[PDB]
């Protein structure tokens, strides 16, 4: 329901490496900006075979 979004806006520092500064900051910043979505298709997830039914229901 809520997750690391508020971490991202609050844990804005030190969520990655910091033992040799200069790469520490770059890695931390990279983890701040999380790596923007991909499809999967029906018959591939929880309750697979409603998905085709999902693909069945619009000819208004």
């Amino acid at each position: 329901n809520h997750f690391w979004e508020i971490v991202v806006q609050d844990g804005i520092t030190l969520i990655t490496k910091e033992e040799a500064s200069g790469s520490s900051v770059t890695a931390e910043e990279a983890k701040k900006f999380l790596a923007k979505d991909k499809p999967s298709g029906d018959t591939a997830a929880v309750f697979e075979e409603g998905g085709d039914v999902d693909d069945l229901l619009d000819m208004i």
């Binding site: 298709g41 018959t43 075979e49 085709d52 039914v53 693909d55 069945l56 229901l57 619009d58 000819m59 208004i60």
Partner: protein, 119 residues
Amino acid sequence: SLLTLLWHCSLDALREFFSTIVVDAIDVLKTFDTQITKKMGYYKILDVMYSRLPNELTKTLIKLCYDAFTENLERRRLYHCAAYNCAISVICCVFNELKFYQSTLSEEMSQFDFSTGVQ
């Protein structure tokens, strides 16, 4: 009888007739042999009516066909074939992608044919 007309009658009339019998077939879609016979006929008419072009309810009825075959007395196998052929029909435009989820002389001659009245 019917399939001859259905496969051949004017496509515009097909629109009219099917639209006239959409819910007329929706309800009846869902001794017992008579039920099975009517259901064969329904599949045999829906599949051919699908064959032309894709009301608002049209969305749902598709699913109500597939399950019909999925059952795990020979009339029952005929029913399985009926449902499966109907699905094969309806799967044309829907799931168009893969993963289908298994003269003087002539006129006078006719005038004389008229005179005898027999061709």
